[PDB]
Amino acid sequence: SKARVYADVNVLRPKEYWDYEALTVQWGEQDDYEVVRKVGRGKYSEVFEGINVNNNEKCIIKILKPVKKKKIKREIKILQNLCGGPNIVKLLDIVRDQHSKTPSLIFEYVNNTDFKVLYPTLTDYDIRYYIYELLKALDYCHSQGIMHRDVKPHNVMIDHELRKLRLIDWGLAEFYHPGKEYNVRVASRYFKGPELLVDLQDYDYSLDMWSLGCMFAGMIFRKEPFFYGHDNHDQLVKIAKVLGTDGLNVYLNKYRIELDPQLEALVGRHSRKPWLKFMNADNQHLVSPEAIDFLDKLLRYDHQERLTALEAMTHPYFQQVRAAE
Numbered sequence: 001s002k003a004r005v006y007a008d009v010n011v012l013r014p015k016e017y018w019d020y021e022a023l024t025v026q027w028g029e030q031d032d033y034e035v036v037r038k039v040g041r042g043k044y045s046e047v048f049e050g051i052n053v054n055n056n057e058k059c060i061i062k063i064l065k066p067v068k069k070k071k072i073k074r075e076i077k078i079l080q081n082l083c084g085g086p087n088i089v090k091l092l093d094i095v096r097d098q099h100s101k102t103p104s105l106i107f108e109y110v111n112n113t114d115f116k117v118l119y120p121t122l123t124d125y126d127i128r129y130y131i132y133e134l135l136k137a138l139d140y141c142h143s144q145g146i147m148h149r150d151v152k153p154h155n156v157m158i159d160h161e162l163r164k165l166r167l168i169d170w171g172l173a174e175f176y177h178p179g180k181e182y183n184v185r186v187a188s189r190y191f192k193g194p195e196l197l198v199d200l201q202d203y204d205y206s207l208d209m210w211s212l213g214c215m216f217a218g219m220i221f222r223k224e225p226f227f228y229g230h231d232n233h234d235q236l237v238k239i240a241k242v243l244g245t246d247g248l249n250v251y252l253n254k255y256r257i258e259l260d261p262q263l264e265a266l267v268g269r270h271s272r273k274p275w276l277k278f279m280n281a282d283n284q285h286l287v288s289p290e291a292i293d294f295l296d297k298l299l300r301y302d303h304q305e306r307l308t309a310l311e312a313m314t315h316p317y318f319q320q321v322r323a324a325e
């Protein structure tokens, strides 16, 4: 399997572009940035709002927890390569604590309202607007030969007041190389694509489109997470109960994948549940025929079947967003 678009991006570019291991970090001054207040945390870092003591402007300080040098260089290289792109967070500096060598990534400031409180207030148009903005970021990184691999509300910072969006945390991102077999232990469970759940390793940019689809489904149906599995096996089960097992079998046979007998047993057999059956009094104001058609073209077992980010942006669902912009 290979990407249907942007497959040769890293083939045509200098090795220095994607060979992140060859990178030699040019450390700045740790003293230049002071922590003001904690704003977030994850299993790989702690994030704070900070201040640049030289110009006194706000910034974001991401202090990384102890991890391998290879992974830290990967995130830095990807951030440098994407800097300046549409709605991509901007890496400004890279510093480390002299004594313990704890690294911190410094970013342009971005305000945010946790999606749990923001999303319930988004109007029909707001959803079209923000998803379009996220798509700009995804088509951009994909066009630059990079898969984010961790698309989820938590990594989509939105300043609702300014209506500004930023795709953050590129710690799981990777460069796409045709034929490469990647680690399937990426993204967050509720947003993992079928390919990861069935161990199909030669995946591509399309993985992010499934995750986007999960996020989108959660938004229009007011059900977060849309696919609520407890462990990786259960995650595939929940997906199967919605898309149906018939399409799963077509997928598995096409890519010659054999499911673990245990997992196969858990999945069982299920008919497809139409998207319309997810509509209720709580989401009726957001479920339009265009939204459903768009969602349908994202949540497909077969990654090669999903809309690319570029195609997604042209879907009629976003017609007013385009006309306006």
Ligand SMILES: O=C(O)Cc1c2ccccc2n2c1[nH]c(=O)c1ccccc12
Pocket (backbone or CB within 6 Å): 039, 040, 041, 045, 047, 060, 062, 089, 090, 107, 108, 109, 110, 111, 112, 157, 168, 169, 170, 171
């Ligand atoms: O790039 C990253 O890995 C994290 C990042 C990040 C990177 C750039 C700008 C803001 C960023 N933020 C975060 N993480 C947060 O939890 C957060 C919470 C509130 C407001 C902003 C946050």
